[PDB]
Amino acid sequence: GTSQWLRKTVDSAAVILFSKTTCPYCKKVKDVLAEAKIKHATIELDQLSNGSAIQKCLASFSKIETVPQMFVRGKFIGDSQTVLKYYSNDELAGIVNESKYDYDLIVIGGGSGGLAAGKEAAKYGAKTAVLDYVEPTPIGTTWGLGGTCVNVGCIPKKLMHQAGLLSHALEDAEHFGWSLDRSKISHNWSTMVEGVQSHIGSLNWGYKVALRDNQVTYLNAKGRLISPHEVQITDKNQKVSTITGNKIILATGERPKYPEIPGAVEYGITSDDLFSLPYFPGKTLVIGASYVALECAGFLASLGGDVTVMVRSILLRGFDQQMAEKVGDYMENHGVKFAKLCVPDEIKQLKVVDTENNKPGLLLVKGHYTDGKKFEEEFETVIFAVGREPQLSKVLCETVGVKLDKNGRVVCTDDEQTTVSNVYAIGDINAGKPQLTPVAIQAGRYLARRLFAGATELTDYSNVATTVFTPLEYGACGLSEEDAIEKYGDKDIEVYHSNFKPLEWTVAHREDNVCYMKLVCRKSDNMRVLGLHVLGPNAGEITQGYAVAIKMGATKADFDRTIGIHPTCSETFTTLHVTKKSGVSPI
Amino acid sequence: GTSQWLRKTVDSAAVILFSKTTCPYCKKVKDVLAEAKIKHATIELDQLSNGSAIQKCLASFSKIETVPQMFVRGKFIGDSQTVLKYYSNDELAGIVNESKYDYDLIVIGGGSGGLAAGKEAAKYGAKTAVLDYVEPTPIGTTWGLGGTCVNVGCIPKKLMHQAGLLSHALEDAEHFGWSLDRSKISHNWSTMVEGVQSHIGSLNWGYKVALRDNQVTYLNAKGRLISPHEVQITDKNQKVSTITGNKIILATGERPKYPEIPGAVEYGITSDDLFSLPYFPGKTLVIGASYVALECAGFLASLGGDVTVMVRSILLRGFDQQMAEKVGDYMENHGVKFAKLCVPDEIKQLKVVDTENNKPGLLLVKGHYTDGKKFEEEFETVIFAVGREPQLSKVLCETVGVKLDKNGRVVCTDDEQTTVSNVYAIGDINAGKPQLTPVAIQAGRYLARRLFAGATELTDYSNVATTVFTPLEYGACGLSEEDAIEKYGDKDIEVYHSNFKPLEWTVAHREDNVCYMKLVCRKSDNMRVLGLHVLGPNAGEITQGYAVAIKMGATKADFDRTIGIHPTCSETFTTLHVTKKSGVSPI
Ligand SMILES: Cc1cc2nc3c(=O)[nH]c(=O)nc-3n(C[C@H](O)[C@H](O)[C@H](O)COP(=O)(O)OP(=O)(O)OC[C@H]3O[C@@H](n4cnc5c(N)ncnc54)[C@H](O)[C@@H]3O)c2cc1C
Ligand SMILES: Cc1cc2nc3c(=O)[nH]c(=O)nc-3n(C[C@H](O)[C@H](O)[C@H](O)COP(=O)(O)OP(=O)(O)OC[C@H]3O[C@@H](n4cnc5c(N)ncnc54)[C@H](O)[C@@H]3O)c2cc1C
């Protein structure tokens, strides 16, 4: 029980000190290590319920039961007199750096998960390398350190969403008494992109500085795992070499897919290209119906674009479909066109992009609906958002022995371990996990603590809240209504719902009865809240706090007994009373 | 136990049906009452754990143990055959309307609490009257039905706050690529006020329609409780009459105080006057430091005003004082001036308000600091925000026997009962309770259900969340840091905190390290979250959801195990790690 925890902690930690808060001899070692700038984990036995049991088991590794005890890479190094002997003899540095591998930890991938894992590991004295390489898109687009979210994901996406939201703010300002001539207002795409990219650049730079300041080795190199402990790296001069590592974290993420049709790769673009595009896309076709497709279509329309979304079947597959339809209805009522039950067959080039005068080209898109009928229309830009895929070398991962699933993602235990015992996987390539930035970050940080600081806490992947940053935002935590009904049966599900109107929308003359929220509850479990859903402004800020309560097992009664904050949109969750079964209107 | 619950329910309900969901004879009575449009409460005994015990005790009131049983104002009226005998004989209407008093419920006051209580009571067949009268301010300002929040409180305040926030949005829009000439943009106060007042008018109208549609008698009359069951009303022709009621709810609220100095009443105004003021206040002095003082000063400055706040001692007394200082620092850095440790002595008139050309007057304010030094400066408008007070006739409430405290507020039990057994008090006049609109609404609705539908649930007044809508908003739920330390001692309090920067502020070039959040936790109680505090945009939307988790007893570990939504401000609450005791910088 505790002896198997101690065994795992001793074997895996790079540099660890077993201590007690009140222990002058422990402080002597702590001060020596701090003066030597030797980073390490510290476990204060007096603060653990099984502290006394741990102190006894330590003798199985050191032949002593006292504190302090210092370990390096699985080996007891000494008590205080011994550590200080190494110190005063200029021997300690060599002792604590001795290793069978080049690194304690090699992270392949410098994105959300990998940077979090590598920084956290270094905190405990793990000798750490982070590898990051950004393979250029088909048109040649590349970017700096930080991964998908920082460079071509959440960060630029939400900044362009804000630019789009500011359009409504300009409209609203007049109703609130501001005098501005909107005949004269227009949007400049390249000025926005320059501001977005300046911020991204500050993040690229910040991550580099952070790795330096934590003594992490950053290699701008492509990595390949060729055996359980061997990573082959290729640098930008195409020099190939091998580095070894005790633990390996795979954190390589995904990249956009293209449909297998003529012209897609040559003439279309993806979200990878959009966020640094030097020209305004112009009349744009977005192919796909994911949150990325709808988010990008949404802000392009708000920035003055002529935008069409081509939808194969449904919107936001995997999300609550009542909410998805309300998201789409708002977009269609606010300037976004939809080509329904339609797929593309080929992209034909009519004009080449004019890179010197910074203007888009022109394309002919041919496709068809499922009545067999044809689709044919011209667009300046075609954006594919038809899913993302991992890029793992299946033949290579096989020969190392890392098991992948149908889709090319890594099959992991609940502590992120692959089928190779020293190799772990985090983030978007971890099969079955929500593909979100804070998930990758929590997984990587928590994994690093287990590996190098004796922690036991696992990442909890259930009831992870999300927000779709469409023109009217959609936040959710927990089950869709249809998923709850499938699990438990319609007679065991109660749904409370209401429309609402933000107070800000009254003077602005925006819509009554578009914003909407519901709670999906389980009758036979004290009206447990299984899922929360809100369509409205600032939906991510609304949703976040409730995710804590849902993780704690909130019931409808817990929402009712809480008092609202007035005036807010969120307070409507504390006074819901109309049930769907009652048939009463939610207006 | 259950017999005393039944006794109380039978005695207090106006019209109540004891039933079981599966009971054709109950449905026969239900359909008759619905066809007769007789409103009533219904208790389905099969849905109560003590249902069988209740069914037996009913024989103590009716001599029968079966369902259905119908009661009116404490008297068993009959089983199904009997009710249907009354129906087919055109006798039922007279039966269910027979009463010793004119009304089952008289509500004195038509604001947040009173309207909620009166509407909810009528739902269960209580014959209900709501009295509302708005005594004019010293300069003659009056308004319609709905109370303080609707007319001169949360609603207009937050709409003018939004007008102020739109100023920053105009500035931000340029950085996000919008081209607008801000040399040419200005704000028109009267256009804003017209829009705000149009919305308020729609609310006045809506409440009137709602009372009509619920068959509540609305009297625009001043009410006085002259004996436990007698309310003297004075209508707008000054006709005096008396109405009687079984239960009385006092819900009369508060009005602004004036300092006892020469010129205050004659020449200054309060928040009652501000929200319909026909002229822009101009150069304004706000006397006071409450949330009302700072909210009003904040939006007046953002709308182009020259604004000074005169502070006797501290800001936001009763709120967390670290947060209060951060609120004030932001205001002082964004255009609001403060006269510190200063009080007024007299207001002198230099120019009369020009009502015909809609322009303010001019005033001379004389005051002093606590070094004895003098204050003397001219202002166009002087707004007092030095607290609010109940307006109850202490001599009258005494002779009826309703006990008041030091401050003139009503001393109530935990079920809102006064010292007179049929008289209750809700909202701002209920001593010791948080003076907020959703508190008054919950108290009134929950009271109405206990009185007329057999409910037992009490209003929970603990950990009620709040938000101060200053230019940078401040949301809070639970204890201030200083209150937690006083209760439990510094060694038992841990505070986790962080600065943050909204992503929206990056491209807009707004401040690093002004937005701020902290969690005040109790070490010896599993790091229980005692108080949550956030300074930032949309602070009310951020805070609300956490209030559910805090009511459920959230710990720091419950916050940590929850995954953030990215990118949001709120997600920072899920990754806090810097403690104040550590001394580490929260930047
Ligand atoms: C348009 C878009 C919008 C999004 N919006 C949100 C949002 O709003 N909120 C949210 O939570 N999530 C959002 N996401 C998802 C979020 O971006 C991902 O969940 C997150 O980036 C995954 O983190 P990761 O560490 O697994 O992978 P990544 O961030 O993709 O990092 C992987 C890194 O490893 C590099 N790499 C790949 N192979 C190698 C190799 N052999 N050697 C070295 N380096 C390699 C990759 O080039 C990359 O830099 C969005 C995604 C997209 C595409
Ligand atoms: C500037 C300001 C801003 C505020 N902002 C917020 C906020 O943002 N969020 C929040 O939760 N709270 C806010 N409040 C507080 C909120 O307005 C009060 O908590 C709420 O209005 C109290 O409700 P009530 O029913 O007790 O009293 P009221 O709403 O004041 O209603 C009492 C009614 O009874 C009338 N009346 C008085 N005497 C009689 C009589 N003898 N006969 C008949 N009628 C009578 C009164 O004129 C009034 O109409 C604010 C208050 C102010 C002044």
What is the DSSP code string of A379-447? ESEEEE-S-EEE---HHHHHHHT--B-TTSPBP--TT-B-SSTTEEE-GGGBTTS---HHHHHHHHHHH
> Do B285 and B310 contact (CB within 8 A), yes or no?
yes
3-state secondary structure at position A161: helix
Sheet of strand B362-369: strand arrangement: B342-351, B362-369, B374-379
d(CA B137, CA B273): 7
* Contact B268 CB / ligand 2 (< 6 Å): no
Sequence-separated (6 or more) residues with CB below 8 Å from residue B222: B131, B133, B135, B233, B234
| Terminal Cα distance for chain A, rounded | 57
Sequence-separated (6 or more) residues with CB below 8 Å from residue B581: B494, B495
Phi, psi of A151 (to 5 degrees): -100, -40
Question: How far apart, in Å, are the Cα atoms of B143 and each of B136, B150, B271, B275, B426?
Answer: 8, 10, 13, 11, 22
Contact A562 B570 (CB under 8 A): no
* Contact list, B559 vs chain A (CB under 8 Å): 548
Kindly identify the ligand whose nearest atom is closest to the C-alpha of A256.
Answer: 1
Any A CB within 8 A of B554 CB: yes
Contact B170 A178 (CB under 8 A): yes
The technique is: X-ray
Any B CB within 8 A of A552 CB: yes
* Contact A148 CB / ligand 1 (< 6 Å): yes
* Contact A125 CB / ligand 1 (< 6 Å): no
Note the Cα B527 to chain centre separation in Å.
31
Q: Which domains does chain B have, with CATH numbers?
A: 1-100 (3.40.30.10), 101-256+387-462 (3.50.50.60), 257-386 (3.50.50.60), 463-587 (3.30.390.30)
* Contact A15 CB / ligand 1 (< 6 Å): no
Contact B507 A437 (CB under 8 A): no
d(CA A51, CA B496): 26
Best of B473, B565, B570, B577 to mutate (most A CBs within 10 Å, chain A): B565
* Contact A271 CB / ligand 1 (< 6 Å): yes
d(CA B331, CA B310): 13
Task: State the nearest Cα–Cα gap between B287 and chain A, in angstroms.
Answer: 25
Contact A570 B540 (CB under 8 A): yes
The β-bridge partners of B310 are B287, B339
The β-bridge partners of A308 are A285, A337
Resolution in A: 1.8
- Ligand 1 centroid from CA A144, angstroms: 12
d(CA A453, CA A124): 7
Interface of A with B in 284-323 (CB under 8 A): 303
Interface of A with B in 425-454 (CB under 8 A): 436-439, 442
The closest residue, in CA terms, to atom 47 on ligand 1 is A134
Contact B548 A549 (CB under 8 A): yes
Known active-site residue B497: no
Which tokens go with B561?
């195990």
Task: Give me the residue from A163, A552, A564 closest to B177, CB to CB.
Answer: A163
- Report, in angstroms and rounded to the nearest whole number, the Rg of chain B calculated over CA atoms: 28
* Contact list, A149 vs chain B (CB under 8 Å): 566
* Contact B251 CB / ligand 2 (< 6 Å): yes
Nearest to B327 by CA among B294, B376, B283: B294
d(CA A445, CA A462): 18
> Do A409 and A431 contact (CB within 8 A), yes or no?
yes
- Name the residue type at position B168: H
Rounded to 5°, the CA angle B482-B486-B492 comes to 95
Task: State the nearest Cα–Cα gap between B459 and chain A, in angstroms.
Answer: 8
Interface of A with B in 184-243 (CB under 8 A): 184-192, 195-196, 198-199
d(CA B555, CA B545): 15
Question: How far apart, in Å, are the Cα atoms of B96 and each of A177, A525, B12, B15?
Answer: 54, 39, 14, 7
